[PDB]
Design a protein around this ligand. Structure first.
Ligand code: PLP
Ligand code: PLP
Lengths: 292, 291
């Protein structure tokens, strides 16, 4: 008990109804149990704590990041908790719902133009960190992001399955989760297939993105992901709805996708123990209408 | 784990910046850690599990309840989880955000008329049940509601504080939480002051209400609460906002009220160890603009 100690050690919960019934088990790592409601609390904690250890920041300082989803909420929370001033940059095209989740933790929101977009904010955010007016977290290139999953998430999944896990499935955003977990799994003796997932070409899945072969985050090791699968937006959205109704698991669209991918992996592997990451709870998705 | 095994054993976290600094401590029991995001998951599990123990219901059957908040979410979740078909009753006064939460777990919503409102929903709901149409849950009179807090919530708080708790503060809705934690606290060697909070005269705070001394839930025993302090709606709202900003605790309005109450108690009692229930996360409150 200190909000920090409530980060991680999330439940791992078996699917009881969905999926093939061919010997294969599919377990869900409920990252929505994190204080601020997503897997991001892990990387936000790690990045900040490790920066503190390196003398880079002290409670009074300002932190900076370009983002507007779970990362923003996570950082804003950790900032509120440890006493930092968060500054989050994003395009001026957001629901008052997303903005309010970040604002509630006291984070200052710097809007950018619809036209400089997400790419603009990463650039502006970089400019400010030169200037000395705050520490940039740089979630796509900061080793401490995947170090959080190497250190905690992976060991937890390994401990919670007694080493029986055979496949791991993660929807890829920054890729910290899959990188960090794969890294850990490679250190074990028995093998573990690592399956990443991204949206189909046309698809839009709020946590994640289709990465072109050059723009890849600097954290990513392509050799740590055994296999990459595409997820149609519609299958992720259906699987998400289904999860709530048939399993009691109320999660976001990426998580729907992760279970969809995990199910495809189970259909193709009889005695598998697949572990999928459920990134967040469904709560912050309700106003977008994707339930219905 | 199984989803029902993630109900309870919620964190208990100490206030670091807020509060008086006179030697007192305030600890927050984070009921938002429950799977469906509120303290209501505990009572929902209990009412359904004990109904199962008594053979009144069975995974195919249909459950009924008149509610429009956290209880509905909790029940719909347990129903989706265990195999039941929830039917939930309420006025057509409630927004899409509230309905959507319950509808998502696959619960049917019987909408009812603004007039014959909350009390009418309670009514219509009633006498679908002695038919065999479905098992009514009746969270206001069902002893299994406080039984959940008697066996889990209280014991957890006792264990988590190492017996050091002096005050327990709880915002009263069904009162299941305060009455269940009280029964447990009263069974213990040292005295623990039990502090119920209710909203002030004109104030409205989502999951709670001012109970007139004759409509009190049947589970409520006035002798188990040592004092009842009133909470102004503005103070609950300010404290809720302050918790997110100053502590990183993101919770609802009743939870803000809980903390405001617990701060009052700590201000006045120099070495108190107060625990306050944080009923839920702030997430479902965002679209009301209260943040
Ligand atoms: C961050 C995020 C992910 C992916 O996590 P990474 O560790 O960044 O790969 C997936 N879904 C949602 C909703 C997220 O916010
Ligand atoms: C149920 C509830 C309460 C009160 O808990 P009881 O055990 O019913 O007294 C307080 N706040 C909120 C938001 C609730 O849903």
């Amino acid at each position: 008990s200190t909000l920090e100690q409530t980060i991680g050690n999330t439940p791992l919960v078996k699917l009881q109804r969905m999926g093939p019934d061919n010997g294969s088990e599919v377990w869900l790592k409920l990252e929505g149990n994190n204080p601020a409601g997503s897997v991001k609390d892990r990387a936000a904690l790690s990045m900040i704590v490790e920066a503190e250890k390196r003398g880079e920041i002290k409670p009074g300082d300002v932190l900076i990041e370009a983002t507007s989803g779970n990362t923003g909420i996570a950082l804003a929370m950790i900032a509120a908790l440890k006493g930092y001033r968060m500054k989050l940059l994003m395009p001026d095209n957001m629901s008052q719902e997303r903005r309010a989740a970040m604002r509630a933790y006291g984070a200052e929101l710097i809007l950018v133009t619809k036209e400089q977009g997400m790419e603009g904010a990463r650039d502006l955010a970089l400019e400010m960190a030169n200037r000395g007016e705050g520490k940039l977290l740089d979630q796509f290139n900061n080793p401490d992001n995947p170090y959080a999953h190497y250190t905690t998430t992976g060991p937890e999944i390994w401990q919670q399955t007694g080493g029986r896990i055979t496949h791991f499935v993660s929807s890829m955003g920054t890729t910290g989760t899959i990188t960090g977990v794969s890294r850990f799994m490679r250190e074990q003796s028995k093998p573990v297939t690592i399956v990443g997932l991204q949206p189909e070409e046309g698809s839009s899945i709020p946590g994640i993105r289709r990465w072109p072969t050059e723009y890849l985050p600097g954290i990513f090791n392509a050799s740590l992901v055994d296999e990459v699968l595409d997820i149609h937006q519609r299958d992720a959205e259906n699987t998400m709805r289904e999860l709530a109704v048939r399993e009691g698991i109320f999660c976001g669209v990426s998580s729907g996708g992760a279970v969809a991918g995990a199910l495809r992996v189970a259909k193709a592997n009889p005695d598998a123990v697949v572990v999928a990451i459920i990134c967040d709870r469904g709560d912050r998705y309700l106003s977008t209408g994707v339930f219905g």
